[PDB]
């Protein structure tokens, strides 16, 4: 019933209390936004660590900076995944846009969708 029980595999990836706080805030935000998350994406036959993916990308300056600086191999490495998973850059970018980028603009304000579309084009 709780987000933690619904997404057990995601909440149990580590014992950092910031994991639970972030994820409860993220799923509440998404539900209030009218875009609730019903299933966590699966990357390399495993649950995508949305908490760690958010920490790594925002630590590098956010989605637009990761795209512009071409840092997807560093993000993949940071997620303890082989960098050579052929479409890791596209999979991680799309997933971030769908599940984490609205939360990033709200909480960190690192960019706007206009700066994002221009970043993908270049």
Swiss-Prot record:
It is found in: Nucleus; Cytoplasm. Induction: By p53/TP53 following DNA damage. Residues 16-108 form the ARID domain. Changing residue 103 to A: Abolishes DNA-binding. Widely expressed, with highest expression in skeletal muscle, thalamus, and colon. Homodimer. Heterodimer with ARID3B. Interacts with E2F1. Interacts with GTF2I and BTK. Transcription factor which may be involved in the control of cell cycle progression by the RB1/E2F1 pathway and in B-cell differentiation. This is AT-rich interactive domain-containing protein 3A. It comes from Homo sapiens (Human). The chain holds residues 223 to 344 of 593 of the full protein.
